[PDB]
Design a protein around this ligand. Structure first.
Ligand code: CHL
Ligand code: CLA
Ligand code: CLA
Ligand code: CLA
Ligand code: CLA
Ligand code: CLA
Ligand code: CLA
Ligand code: CLA
Ligand SMILES: CC1=C[C@H](O)CC(C)(C)[C@H]1/C=C/C(C)=C/C=C/C(C)=C/C=C/C=C(C)/C=C/C=C(C)/C=C/C1=C(C)C[C@H](O)CC1(C)C
Ligand SMILES: CC1=C[C@H](O)CC(C)(C)[C@H]1/C=C/C(C)=C/C=C/C(C)=C/C=C/C=C(C)/C=C/C=C(C)/C=C/C1=C(C)C[C@H](O)CC1(C)C
Lengths: 229, 202, 212, 39, 223
């Protein structure tokens, strides 16, 4: 059983039962089981949104260049109004989220389709529905769940790397990667900022100020800019 | 007992009806504490003058001992790494730790070897006797392995200490009255023993 | 056996080591009674938690204020928040005393009757306002991540860490107050001034802390 | 500490504390409301 | 078993199990066994890094007698391929690889016999007979008997610790390297001594590196 540090001991509440369990809980946040169910669900949901987000930013930069993905909410155009899109998103996501949360707090209680009395989703575990959500499976679930949590943790780290590299450099992930491939010794985070007890230098934020949308002036701050270097 | 020559004209080591800070246990222990601080005081008040005399330390240092910043009315050396109050707070903290742990071993014998002090606990186990802890650091070399040799070394410490206490009182009186350093008083008494005495400096 | 604040002296009889941060420090014997010591344990925890919260506010606002982000220094922050926004001072004071008096009176009458605020009289809630210990009210609201009911020895470790960081932040907040009263500057300005000249910029150069 | 609060519960100590409280309350009233003769 | 001084009795926990034991612990720091194991590992680390540093400063001064190792850390004072390099990326390389190897050795201390194997190529493993003595690929020539070589290793390391802090102290005092100071003492031994050179630190007071200023310190208030 591999670990986050090979040689140490996992915490006593981490047996190896859940997928992606490598004994990593220094703060002891999973010692409550009723908490651990919620955090397993939240880990799966954050990982799936971050995987879809990293794939979206990568395909969005490959297919449509000269569109900085941090400015995608600004420079998009549609006859669809902003409040209409936000209202559709609000009602439809409130629906889907409340269905999933009801399956969380009551295990296996929203399996049946409400409109059509024929279709009922088969029994399962929480976080892994199946049925129409999984029409085609390659291989076995006991390895695909581990693959899913590994790619998901890696994509969560990738998304916060995208946010920090966009706030520091002002360029997309492929453009910043080509910047690091041009001058690897000169373009790192160590090569842009340093704190010494004499003085501290931080990179300038390349996202300027409050961004003017259609007469509302959205404030656009850069994440914890005082604690950067 | 070390230095017991019977010289007690005012009778302060009487064990009968004693108390307070006048006890043989406090008086002998304070006698050797004053003795050791006065040995260090005598050597420290001589050494810049004789090292400036021999030409080992420069003339920016080698000042008289009361011009160091002890009495800034009497003169103060500027050239330390800080102001003397910045020095003095470090002295407060350091001597508070040292003197206060020493007090706790006097009031509770052996109590400085239990509570964690960064591994420094076997060093401060002390003895069943104040003023002479020993151990691995306060007696590094095994000097005084023979009990008679230990008594002789305690007696030599007593006599060198009492001589140094008289010497430090002499440094004070000499520094007030003639306004010069003690090695300067050596030079002036060895140059003219008749015309440079206490009788001349009145 | 256990480390005492003053090595050599024994701890007093009313301080046993059951409490978190129990170093036997009671030279004025303010807590000889068990009920008065219980009340002082909870007062120590409340002062400590407010000092940790306020001290993290001081440190973050000063980090944001030295680097040019426009943040005020903490002795000017209330004035510039009341004047920058259109906030009236006394209405925000009275709303603060409303909410804080509600929460603090719930805490008060749970000290007086040690299980009584979980009777369902507040809106419908039961056992989420039942306490666990004196000053340790962990349920679903106050301990949502749930660390006080699994690995109890690790929870005692967190109690020790909480009391130590709280005492450290109380003396840090007293530091900010007296530090500004002497120097007239923000605290990380004083930290930068100490890093500039450590040997010459300190409390023995102000003319205030030692007036000699 | 129980005996110290019992001593603080004695008659001249409580009379001192209570008359200090009453006199200070009257003094603060006569400061913030200077010279009341009516109402 | 000669000790550090005649007449001194060795402590009870100092017996001869560790190499280079002279019974010299006047502060009692090794009274706890786990702390003693930690300070033995720290002694080995300081000893080996100081032997590397002394042999370094020696060769650097011999081969190129214009380095002056106290100024060798600057970007301008660097060899022919990398001589105007960004120090941030260099510190990035050093931080990543040193954090790796350091955490491996730290887990060796925490669990003895748990990080012997190569995590990538699982048919590779170092047999460590003692803690602090890995062997295998770290001992390619394989002369390991072992006890006398460990005594040679710890005596050489203690001598090199003293000699390296000698190098630093002397080089802050008179501003020269070790071989130049040795030639200065062999030129005249009475002038250019420690009695004259001390009291004046040659520390150049906060050298401005490419973007930042490092605060520079001397070990004594010389100025
Ligand atoms: C939930 C995921 C989500 C994330 C991570 C972002 C992130 C961003 N939005 Mg986007 N948005 C997101 C959802 C949406 N946005 C928009 C419509 C916009 C617009 C019109 C704009 C952005 C802008 C931004 C950027 C900076 C905003 C900021 O600094 O926050 C500060 C503001 C808040 C925290 C408001 C509170 C919102 C609440 C916490 C949620 C950043 C790329 C701005 C931009 O691109 O300028 C650089 C911008 O002008 N977004 C809509 C409506 C369709 C969304 C709904 O899904
Ligand atoms: C909407 C107005 C607004 C504006 C213009 C700012 C501006 C700033 N914030 Mg602040 N912040 C705000 C609201 C705002 N904040 C709110 C409502 C919170 C509580 C969640 C915070 C919590 C916060 C923290 C902890 C810190 C800042 C910091 C900063 C400064 C650096 C930029 C940054 O770190 O992103 C902002 C930081 C975030 C974590 C993003 C939250 C901000 C969005 C706009 C909240 C919107 C929620 C609202 C209900 C709608 C910058 C001056 C940093 C600083 O320098 O402080 C000294 C810093 O450390 N902010
Ligand atoms: C004023 C009346 C008074 C009288 C009659 C006494 C009498 C006594 N005291 Mg008490 N005491 C007093 C005031 C007095 N004290 C005050 C004001 C304090 C607080 C400082 C104390 C605190 C005290 C302690 C802690 C102890 C005593 C002890 C004693 C007993 C022996 C002292 C002795 O002879 O040692 C000889 C005196 C000395 C070695 C000290 C002399 C030098 C000090 C610094 C005093 C200097 C006085 C001088 C006027 C100052 C000149 C200043 C000028 C040069 C600038 C004796 C019964 C001791 C005891 O109980 O033993 C049985 C004991 O341990 N006293
Ligand atoms: C904020 C107020 C406060 C309160 C109510 C307590 C309460 C307690 N402390 Mg804690 N303590 C505090 C702050 C506080 N502490 C701080 C800031 C430190 C770090 C210096 C400590 C360090 C400490 C240690 C090491 C220990 C305690 C212990 C205790 C417990 C028993 C002692 C007692 O009965 O005193 C009750 C205290 C009060 C009723 C308040 C005293 C306020 C006085 C009257 C004012 C003067 C304070 C100070 C001298 C000057 C500050 C004024 C300023 C303007 C200059 C009790 C629960 C002991 C314990 O068993 O822990 C569980 C223990 O071992 N405390
Ligand atoms: C930072 C030190 C610290 C530590 C070790 C603790 C530890 C504890 N708290 Mg306490 N608490 C703290 C600060 C801390 N607290 C502060 C500042 C407040 C005021 C907001 C509180 C208010 C509070 C309440 C109301 C309750 C607790 C409870 C507890 C206990 C269980 C919860 C837990 O394990 O969280 C572990 C704590 C941490 C992992 C610290 C995280 C530090 C953050 C990440 C700092 C960064 C954020 C900051 C804004 C900057 C545990 C003893 C509960 C309890 O006693 O249940 C029986 C409980 O009900 N705490
Ligand atoms: C016994 C006869 C007597 C009477 C009827 C008064 C009455 C008064 N004196 Mg006089 N006075 C007296 C004896 C008397 N005094 C004596 C013996 C002395 C010398 C010690 C003085 C010296 C004196 C001074 C120097 C002053 C007065 C003042 C006053 C006025 C104070 C009103 C007040 O306190 O605010 C109102 C009090 C309260 C609100 C406190 C009561 C709290 C309860 C809860 C209120 C309940 C209300 C429903 C009041 C008319 C003051 C004045 O200005 O006179 C015009 C004033 O400055 N008196
Ligand atoms: C000269 C001092 C010295 C001595 C006597 C030793 C002796 C030993 N080392 Mg140690 N070692 C040293 C310096 C020394 N080392 C330094 C400076 C480092 C840091 C690079 C190390 C890092 C190290 C590791 C990682 C390991 C050892 C191990 C060993 C043991 C067996 C290996 C061997 O046979 O080498 C005998 C040593 C010599 C013959 C010294 C020759 C000196 C060379 C030729 C100088 C090179 C010129 C220079 C660059 C200028 C033996 C006790 C191994 C072990 O204990 O495995 C069980 C082991 O794994 N050493
Ligand atoms: C042992 C007590 C002692 C103390 C407290 C001092 C203190 C001082 N020395 Mg002196 N000095 C001493 C003995 C001492 N010295 C000895 C034994 C020598 C011959 C090696 C010197 C030769 C000497 C020179 C040439 C100079 C000083 C200077 C100084 C002053 C600045 C510190 C410095 O940079 O010197 C360096 C530190 C030392 C010499 C002390 C290390 C050696 C001792 C024995 C360690 C104990 C400081 C007042 C400097 C000065 O006067 O500036 C105006 C200065 O230029 N010292
Ligand atoms: C015997 C008897 C008996 C009977 O019974 C009674 C009677 C008579 C009472 C008695 C007597 C007694 C006596 C005589 C006493 C004396 C004492 C003294 C003198 C002390 C000093 C003592 C003294 C002392 C300690 C001193 C110390 C000193 C010091 C540290 C110093 C230091 C220093 C130095 C280095 C240098 C610099 O610059 C600084 C200083 C800071 C300055
Ligand atoms: C124990 C004992 C015992 C014996 O018996 C006796 C004795 C010794 C007496 C005792 C002791 C005591 C002590 C030491 C005490 C201390 C305390 C403290 C310091 C507290 C603080 C405490 C402190 C605290 C709370 C604090 C808090 C704070 C805060 C909130 C802050 C806030 C703020 C901020 C953020 C910023 C803004 O802009 C403003 C403000 C508003 C300003």
């Amino acid at each position: 059983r591999p670990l986050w540090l090979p040689g140490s001991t996992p915490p006593a509440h981490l047996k190896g039962d859940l997928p992606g369990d490598f004994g990593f809980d220094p703060l002891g946040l999973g010692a409550n089981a009723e908490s651990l169910k919620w955090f397993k669900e939240s880990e799966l949901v954050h990982s799936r949104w971050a995987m879809a987000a990293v794939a979206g930013i990568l395909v969005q930069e490959i297919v449509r260049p000269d569109v900085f993905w941090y400015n995608a909410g600004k420079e998009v155009e549609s006859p669809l109004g902003p409040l209409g899109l936000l209202a559709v998103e609000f009602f439809l996501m409130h629906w889907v989220e409340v269905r999933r949360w009801q399956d969380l707090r009551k295990p296996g209680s929203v399996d049946q389709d409400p409109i059509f009395s024929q279709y009922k989703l088969p029994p399962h575990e929480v976080g892994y529905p199946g049925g129409v959500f999984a029409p085609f499976i390659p291989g076995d679930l006991a390895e695909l769940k581990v693959k899913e949590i590994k790619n998901g943790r890696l994509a969560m780290l990738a998304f916060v790397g995208f946010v920090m590299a966009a706030q520091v450099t002002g360029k997309g992930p492929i453009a910043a990667l080509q910047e690091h491939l041009a001058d690897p010794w000169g373009t790192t985070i160590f090569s842009k900022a340093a704190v010494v007890p004499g003085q501290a230098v931080a990179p300038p934020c390349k996202i300027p100020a409050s961004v003017s949308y259609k007469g509302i002036e959205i404030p656009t701050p850069c994440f914890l800019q005082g604690l950067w270097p | 007992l070390p230095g017991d020559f019977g010289f007690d004209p005012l009778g302060l080591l009487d064990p009968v009806n004693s108390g307070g800070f006048i006890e043989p246990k406090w008086l002998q222990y304070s006698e050797v504490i004053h003795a050791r601080w006065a040995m260090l005081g005598a050597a420290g008040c001589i050494a810049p003058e004789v090292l400036g005399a021999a030409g080992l330390i420069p003339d920016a240092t080698n000042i008289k001992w009361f011009e160091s910043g002890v009495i800034p009315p009497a003169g103060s050396y500027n050239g330390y790494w800080a102001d003397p109050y910045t020095i003095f707070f470090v002295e407060i903290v350091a001597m508070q730790f040292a003197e206060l742990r020493r007090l706790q071993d006097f009031r509770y014998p052996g109590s400085m070897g239990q509570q964690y002090f960064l591994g420094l606990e076997a060093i401060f186990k002390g003895s069943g006797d104040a003023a002479y802890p020993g151990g691995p650091f306060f007696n590094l070399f095994n000097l005084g392995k023979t009990e008679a040799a230990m008594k002789e070394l305690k007696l030599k410490e007593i006599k060198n200490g009492r001589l140094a206490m008289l010497a430090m009182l002499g440094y004070g009186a000499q520094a007030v009255m003639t306004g010069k350093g003690p090695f300067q008083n050596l030079v002036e008494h060895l140059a003219d023993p008749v015309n440079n005495n206490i009788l001349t400096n009145f | 056996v256990r480390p005492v604040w003053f090595p050599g002296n024994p701890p007093p009889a009313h301080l046993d080591g059951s409490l978190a941060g129990d170093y036997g420090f009671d030279p004025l014997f303010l807590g000889q009674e068990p009920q008065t010591l219980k009340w002082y344990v909870q007062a120590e925890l409340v002062h400590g938690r407010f000092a940790m919260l306020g001290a993290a506010g001081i440190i973050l606002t000063s980090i944001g204020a030295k680097v040019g982000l426009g943040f005020p220094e903490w002795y000017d922050a209330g004035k510039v928040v009341v004047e920058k926004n259109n906030i009236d001072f006394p209405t925000l004071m009275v709303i603060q005393f409303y909410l804080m008096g509600w929460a603090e009176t719930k805490r008060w009458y749970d000290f007086k009757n040690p299980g009584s605020q979980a009777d369902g009289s507040f809106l419908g809630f039961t056992e989420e306002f039942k306490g666990l210990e004196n000053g340790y009210p962990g349920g679903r609201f106050f301990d949502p991540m749930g660390l006080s009911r699994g690995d109890a020895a690790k929870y005692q470790e967190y109690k020790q860490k909480e009391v130590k960081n709280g005492r450290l932040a109380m003396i840090a907040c007293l530091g900010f107050a007296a530090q500004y009263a002497a120097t007239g500057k923000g605290p990380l300005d004083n930290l930068a001034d100490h890093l500039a000249d450590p040997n010459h910029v300190n409390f023995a150069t102000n003319g205030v802390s030692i007036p000699i | 500490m129980k005996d110290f609060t019992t001593y603080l519960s004695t008659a001249p100590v409580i009379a001192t504390i209570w008359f200090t409280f009453t006199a200070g309350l009257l003094i603060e009233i006569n400061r913030y409301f200077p010279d009341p003769l009516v109402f | 078993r000669k000790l550090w001084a005649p007449g001194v009795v060795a402590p009870e926990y100092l017996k001869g199990d560790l190499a280079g034991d002279y019974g010299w612990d006047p502060l009692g720091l090794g009274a706890d066994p786990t702390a003693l194991k930690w300070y033995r590992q720290s002694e080995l680390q300081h000893a080996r890094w100081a032997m590397l540093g002394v042999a370094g400063v020696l060769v650097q001064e011999i081969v190129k007698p214009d380095v002056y190792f106290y100024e060798a850390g600057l970007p301008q004072n660097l060899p022919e391929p990398f001589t105007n390099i960004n120090m941030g990326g260099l510190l990035a390389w050093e931080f990543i690889l040193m954090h790796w190897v350091e955490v491996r050795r730290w887990q060796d201390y925490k669990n003895f016999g748990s990080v012997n194997e190569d995590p990538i190529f699982k048919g590779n493993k170092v047999p460590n007979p003692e803690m602090g003595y890995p062997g295998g690929i770290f001992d390619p020539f394989g002369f390991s008997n072992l006890k006398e070589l460990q005594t040679k290793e710890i005596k050489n390391g203690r001598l090199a610790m003293i000699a390296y802090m000698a190098f630093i102290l002397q080089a802050q005092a008179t501003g020269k390297g070790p071989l130049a100071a040795l030639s200065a003492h062999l030129s005249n031994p009475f002038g250019n001594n420690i009695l004259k050179n001390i009291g004046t630190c040659t520390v150049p007071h906060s050298v401005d590196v490419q973007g930042l200023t490092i605060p520079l310190t001397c070990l004594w208030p010389g100025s």
